[PDB]
Amino acid sequence: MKLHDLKPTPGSRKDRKRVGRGPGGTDKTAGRGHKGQKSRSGAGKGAFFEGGRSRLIARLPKRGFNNVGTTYEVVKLSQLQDLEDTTFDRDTLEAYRLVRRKNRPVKLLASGEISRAVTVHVDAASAAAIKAVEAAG
Amino acid sequence: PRAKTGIVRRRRHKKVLKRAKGFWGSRSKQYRNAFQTLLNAATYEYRDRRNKKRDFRRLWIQRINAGARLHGMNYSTFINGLKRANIDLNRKVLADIAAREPEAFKALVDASRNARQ
Amino acid sequence: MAQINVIGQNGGRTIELPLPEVNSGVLHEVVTWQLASRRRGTASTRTRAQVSKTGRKMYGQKGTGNARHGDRSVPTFVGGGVAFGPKPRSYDYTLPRQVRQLGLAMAIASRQEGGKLVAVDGFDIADAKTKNFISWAKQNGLDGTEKVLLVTDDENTRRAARNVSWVSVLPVAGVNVYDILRHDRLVIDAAALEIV
Amino acid sequence: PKMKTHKMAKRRIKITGTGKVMAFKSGKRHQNTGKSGDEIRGKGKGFVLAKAEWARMKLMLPR
Amino acid sequence: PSAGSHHNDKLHFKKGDTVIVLSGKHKGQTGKVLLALPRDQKVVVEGVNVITKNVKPSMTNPQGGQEQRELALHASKVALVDPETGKATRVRKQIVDGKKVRVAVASGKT
RNA sequence: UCAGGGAACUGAAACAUCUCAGUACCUGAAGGAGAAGAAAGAGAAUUCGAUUCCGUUAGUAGCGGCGAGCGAACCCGGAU
RNA sequence: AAGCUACACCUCAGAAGGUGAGAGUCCUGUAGGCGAACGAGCCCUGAGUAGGUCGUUGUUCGUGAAACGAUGACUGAAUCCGCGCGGACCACCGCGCAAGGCUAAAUACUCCCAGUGACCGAUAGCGCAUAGUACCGUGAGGGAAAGGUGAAAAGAACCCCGGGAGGGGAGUGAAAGAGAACCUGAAACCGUGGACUUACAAGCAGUCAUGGCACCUUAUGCGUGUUAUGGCGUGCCUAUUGAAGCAUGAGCCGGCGACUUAGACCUGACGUGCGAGCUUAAGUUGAAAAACGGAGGCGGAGC
RNA sequence: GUAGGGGAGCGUUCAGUCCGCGGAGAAGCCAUACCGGAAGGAGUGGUGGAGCCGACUGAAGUGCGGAUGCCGGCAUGAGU
Ligand SMILES: [Ca+2]
Ligand SMILES: [Ca+2]
Ligand SMILES: [Mg+2]
Ligand SMILES: [Mg+2]
Ligand SMILES: [Mg+2]
Ligand SMILES: [Mg+2]
Ligand SMILES: [Mg+2]
Ligand SMILES: [Mg+2]
Ligand SMILES: [Mg+2]
Ligand SMILES: [Mg+2]
Ligand SMILES: [Mg+2]
Ligand SMILES: [Mg+2]
Ligand SMILES: [Mg+2]
Ligand SMILES: [Mg+2]
Ligand SMILES: [Mg+2]
Ligand SMILES: [Mg+2]
Ligand SMILES: [Mg+2]
Ligand SMILES: [Mg+2]
Ligand SMILES: [Mg+2]
Ligand SMILES: [Mg+2]
Ligand SMILES: [Mg+2]
Ligand SMILES: [Mg+2]
Ligand SMILES: [Mg+2]
Ligand SMILES: [Mg+2]
Ligand SMILES: [Mg+2]
Ligand SMILES: [Mg+2]
Ligand SMILES: [Mg+2]
Ligand SMILES: [Mg+2]
Ligand SMILES: [Mg+2]
Ligand SMILES: [Mg+2]
Ligand SMILES: [Mg+2]
Ligand SMILES: [Mg+2]
Ligand SMILES: [Mg+2]
Ligand SMILES: [Mg+2]
Ligand SMILES: [Mg+2]
Ligand SMILES: [Mg+2]
Ligand SMILES: [Mg+2]
Ligand SMILES: [Mg+2]
Ligand SMILES: [Mg+2]
Ligand SMILES: [Mg+2]
Ligand SMILES: [Mg+2]
Ligand SMILES: [Mg+2]
Ligand SMILES: [Mg+2]
Ligand SMILES: [Mg+2]
Ligand SMILES: [Mg+2]
Ligand SMILES: [Mg+2]
Ligand SMILES: [Mg+2]
Ligand SMILES: [Mg+2]
Ligand SMILES: [Mg+2]
Ligand SMILES: [Mg+2]
Ligand SMILES: [Mg+2]
Ligand SMILES: [Mg+2]
Ligand SMILES: [Mg+2]
Ligand SMILES: [Mg+2]
Ligand SMILES: [Mg+2]
Ligand SMILES: [Mg+2]
Ligand SMILES: [Mg+2]
Ligand SMILES: [Mg+2]
Ligand SMILES: [Mg+2]
Ligand SMILES: [Mg+2]
Ligand SMILES: [Mg+2]
Ligand SMILES: [Mg+2]
Ligand SMILES: [Mg+2]
Ligand SMILES: [Mg+2]
Ligand SMILES: [Mg+2]
Ligand SMILES: [Mg+2]
Ligand SMILES: [Mg+2]
């Protein structure tokens, strides 16, 4: 194809602002306003009286489970999925964390997933449909 | 890549300078007074065009009542009496009719006066 | 589709090419990425200050009657210090993989309007001599009214014509959405990369 | 780079939700208090309004 | 400006060779080599020469004096010949005793 | 490169802690590099296995007139 | 002549430079090949200690519940059923053997050399097309401008005015419309000649209208130049409630001269790829080209 | 219509590709009454004496009247 006739998608490159450079637009004072602290710059997100200082209730740690909501789990067609197959088949990205499932609309057929722990009411709807769930003994 | 000003600035300046013909003094030779004179000259060109319309208006009129009064009526009681003669409406530069054919401007005087009776 | 080969076989073969009339959009952005990635970043210029070589404080803050001024090393001076000059930098960026593999596929695809000669082996060149490569190509309509890009595998066989003004060699791998797109035809040769 | 202003974190401004900025309710901290029993209680959890854009980039990674 | 030695400071001919000019006014004309200065790539051959108006006084004489004299060429002349014009040149392939690397073209020795 | 000394403008919209920064500068020693180096370690798996460098962890954990602001390491992937 | 042209030829060599203008085949070279005498180059296991109190300090460590290492002052242990640590401290449970030394490589830098460049090309680029010179300073120290005959010196014999300087000829050369105050040669500034004009005139210097006089190469017109006379008409910028302002700046012209860069950083618009999934970093290998590399990052659950 | 936001564009250098031009003469410079809605662009002539235009894409040290701005040249005051 002609390199003369290559053309980038319209609208995918727009031109830079050339600030200065005429009374055809953006004259004299640049984008800037006139006097004032607008000039060679500094100072951040700070109002320089009293910045809305509200009080501080605090506790330092945390550690949260990796999620497997079971609504995708039922259309899965493949069943009886041990979860170390699952991280290495799809889903469950987190290597540093532990896995948990939870209720999302339905459950339907049988299955048997070996997750690190799960909601108690999944056992209310996984045990129905003749399924086990292994908390990691 | 450096991209110095060369050839660009001289071309622009020379076009300004060439707009300056018989401008007096450094109006014709120094770029800065040439360009500055041209700013004020912009003002004058536009205003004057509109005004030249109104100026020939004035010259028109000033001939027309001179002929009118030569026939014993002023502009006022004339351009009235053509318009009161209604369909007579030639209006645009009656000046020239008064200024070259007096046999005709006399007939137009008689027409206006007949219409005012 | 599936154009005829040369010496080895002569089978048909056309892969499902990305051919929605192969837009110039993706093709252009791949070419721009390559010309950008290969650019060297070697354009130093002297900083306003300390990289420039000059002095001190010059004279009287007030009262000399001359203008204000501070040192001989500033952009308003005709001395030294470019303010906002080029400094060495890199322009290379990881373009997403899907788009460059789509790019070379589209490039090969763009030559199926009218172009792309045999992918197979066709080397009746007397070990490695240009006049004989010129004859081989001359029997294929490669008379050199059109620049042509060759790709293959045998150093003995590309060596035949690294010289000729129309052709240029590249080995297997090392193909280029830009190279095959900037030559007027593609002697694809090397059937191995062509088929899977 | 980009710090969080750690003045945002265990301080009010939970980032949470559909992207909106909760904050607390303030007066009568542990500074002295007689005052009403229906205000000493109504100091739980507020949520601000037209300042959120400032609060967010204090702590856009939700620490 | 560095000069002359883009030609690796080598001459393609010797101090006493017969040589022919191709170039300008003197193309196709022949002469013996007389001065060969290699590092400025200058060559003097008989019959190329011209009228140097000469030192107005006192080169032991009062009046000046025009006189015809040699005017050297850049190695823009083309060199050794035998098969009777032009001639490229290659052979450096041992005369008698096998030591001297004589010259040849498409033909014999120079 | 390592070491012995070690600023201040500045920011904090004033300034003492704090920052600037162990930056500039001075001094000593050495080489083609130097420093470091072979666990009374890291760390929470009864994992690891000299040092250095790069990526990431992560601006996370923390530090802080809890202000301005400063800011790790482990695991893991590489160079050797 | 290297360009045009017409017929050829080599090519493992059409990278490049020179050559009276643009050379694959004229020169130097290039791919490739060869290549030297001397030449350079991979019963024990560390005590004035460990530990402690006082002052301090380092790592995220700002005396904080402040561990541990570190020494300045004073003290001062234990042996393998023993010794140090695991962030006050205790028990349990774990990790490790202090007070002896050496140790290549992966790392940094650029006086020096080579190659390369969406780097400059004479106010740029190093300060220097070379100079730490001239010049300034008692010194420490600071610190310039810098260019071009012609292809080849063939560098102007001889004559003329002149003490010379300078020029005019003759010659050379394609050109002297290149002559050594030597490529081009803009503008400000200085002049000579010509056209149209100007010695009762009040003027931000123009503008518009009309007459006069010239002229005729985008050009006999809705021309071009210049004039006389009428009407109208308060420089430019900045700063300002408000500028012709007797408010700032500026003698003029030339050139230099100011919204950039960076980062796996944030947040939006537009565009492309793949889409419930998207993507790599450092690096490895190949480079007249780019592939590989899932560590890790973003969605997916909230309170 | 001032600050300000938005839109479409002109010109300069460099890079990639194309189409080409050049000693029967290139860029640059000089004159000009032609053209385009503007930035601007062409025609012809004079000068010059070796390089260069147009189109599409890309990257910018990219557009000056000011800064008692810088460097340089030249003026006024003055034949004082
Ligand atoms: Ca006098
Ligand atoms: Ca006087
Ligand atoms: Mg930008
Ligand atoms: Mg705009
Ligand atoms: Mg201002
Ligand atoms: Mg400032
Ligand atoms: Mg800040
Ligand atoms: Mg206050
Ligand atoms: Mg994730
Ligand atoms: Mg007016
Ligand atoms: Mg009327
Ligand atoms: Mg003054
Ligand atoms: Mg400089
Ligand atoms: Mg950019
Ligand atoms: Mg929360
Ligand atoms: Mg202070
Ligand atoms: Mg301060
Ligand atoms: Mg202090
Ligand atoms: Mg330093
Ligand atoms: Mg030192
Ligand atoms: Mg020493
Ligand atoms: Mg590792
Ligand atoms: Mg050549
Ligand atoms: Mg030829
Ligand atoms: Mg021991
Ligand atoms: Mg101690
Ligand atoms: Mg202590
Ligand atoms: Mg404190
Ligand atoms: Mg302890
Ligand atoms: Mg300790
Ligand atoms: Mg513990
Ligand atoms: Mg350039
Ligand atoms: Mg210089
Ligand atoms: Mg100069
Ligand atoms: Mg200097
Ligand atoms: Mg002195
Ligand atoms: Mg001296
Ligand atoms: Mg020369
Ligand atoms: Mg003279
Ligand atoms: Mg003389
Ligand atoms: Mg002649
Ligand atoms: Mg002359
Ligand atoms: Mg000349
Ligand atoms: Mg002279
Ligand atoms: Mg020349
Ligand atoms: Mg000259
Ligand atoms: Mg005169
Ligand atoms: Mg005159
Ligand atoms: Mg009078
Ligand atoms: Mg008069
Ligand atoms: Mg007067
Ligand atoms: Mg007048
Ligand atoms: Mg005022
Ligand atoms: Mg006013
Ligand atoms: Mg005044
Ligand atoms: Mg004034
Ligand atoms: Mg003032
Ligand atoms: Mg003044
Ligand atoms: Mg990122
Ligand atoms: Mg980083
Ligand atoms: Mg010409
Ligand atoms: Mg023009
Ligand atoms: Mg020439
Ligand atoms: Mg600039
Ligand atoms: Mg301005
Ligand atoms: Mg100025
Ligand atoms: Mg000056």
Q: Where are the domains of chain E?
A: 1-110
In chain A, which among 26-55 make CB contacts under 8 A with chain D? Answer: 45, 52, 54-55
Q: Is the CB of D6 under 7 A from strand F?
A: yes
Could you tell me which of D19, D18, D40 has the C-alpha nearest to residue D31?
A: D40
Strands E29-37 and E42-45: antiparallel
C170's enclosing H/E stretch is strand C167-171
Residue D62 near residue D8, CB atoms below 8 Å: no
- C168 CA – G114 C1', rounded, Å: 28
Where are the alpha helices (H) located in chain A, listed in sequence order? 71-74, 83-87, 120-126
Structure tokens at A74: 């039922």
Write down the domain spans for chain C.
1-196
Q: Is the CB of A38 under 7 A from strand H?
A: no
Residue D60: how many CB atoms within 10 A of its CB?
Answer: 12
Smallest Cβ–Cβ distance between A54 and the set D12, D54, D57 belongs to D12
Q: Which residues of B60-83 are buried (b: 16+ CB within 10 A; e: fewer)?
A: beebbbebbeebebebeebbebbe
CB-based burial label for C22 (10 Å; 0-12, 13-18, 19+) = buried
φ/ψ (deg, to 5) at C182: -100, -25
3-state secondary structure of E96: coil
The Cα-based distances of A128 to A23, A76, A136, C51 in angstroms read 77, 18, 21, 77
Beta bridge partners of C167: C148
Cβ separation of C25 and A8 shorter than 8 Å? Answer: yes
B68's enclosing H/E stretch is helix B31-70
Structure tokens at A98: 């532990």
Could you tell me which of C96, C79, C82 has the C-alpha nearest to residue C29?
A: C96
> What's the half-sphere exposure (Cβ side, CA atoms, 13 Å) at A101?
30
The angle at the Cα of C143, spanning C142 to C144, to the nearest 5 degrees, equals: 90
Strands C185-187 and C148-152: parallel
Where are the alpha helices (H) located in B71-101, listed in sequence order? 76-83, 94-100
Residue A81 near residue A113, CB atoms below 8 Å: yes
Q: Is the CB of A61 under 7 A from strand F?
A: yes
CB-based burial label for D41 (10 Å; 0-12, 13-18, 19+) = exposed
CA B30 to chain centre: 32
Residue C166 near residue C146, CB atoms below 8 Å: yes
User: How many domains are contained in chain D?
Assistant: 1
Structure tokens at A112: 């048997």
Residue A133: how many CB atoms within 10 A of its CB?
Answer: 17
CA C38 to chain centre: 8
The Cα-based distances of D39 to B82, D11, D26 in angstroms read 91, 21, 11
Q: Residue D5 belongs to what domain range?
A: 1-63
Q: Is the CB of B27 under 7 A from strand H?
A: no
For chain E, list the strands marked E by DSSP: 18-21, 29-37, 42-45, 50-52, 67-69, 73-74
Could you tell me which of B110, B111, B105, B66 has the C-alpha nearest to residue B85?
A: B111
- E94 CA – G44 C1', rounded, Å: 86
Token pair 């009062």: residue: E62
Using the CA of E73, give the nucleotide whose C1' is nearest. Answer: G152
C57's enclosing H/E stretch is none
φ/ψ (deg, to 5) at D23: -140, -175
Token pair 């854009």: residue: D53
Q: D31 — alpha (psi -120 to 50), left (phi > 0) or beta? A: beta
Smallest Cβ–Cβ distance between A55 and the set D26, D51, D54 belongs to D26
Residue E68 near residue E50, CB atoms below 8 Å: yes
Could you tell me which of A106, A125, A117 has the C-alpha nearest to residue A83?
A: A117
Structure tokens at E25: 């006014």
Structure determined via:
X-ray
Distance (Å) from CA A94 to ligand 9 centroid: 7
**Type of residue numbered C1:** M
The angle at the Cα of A92, spanning A91 to A96, to the nearest 5 degrees, equals: 155
Residues 6+ apart with CB under 8 A from A67: A100, A101, A102
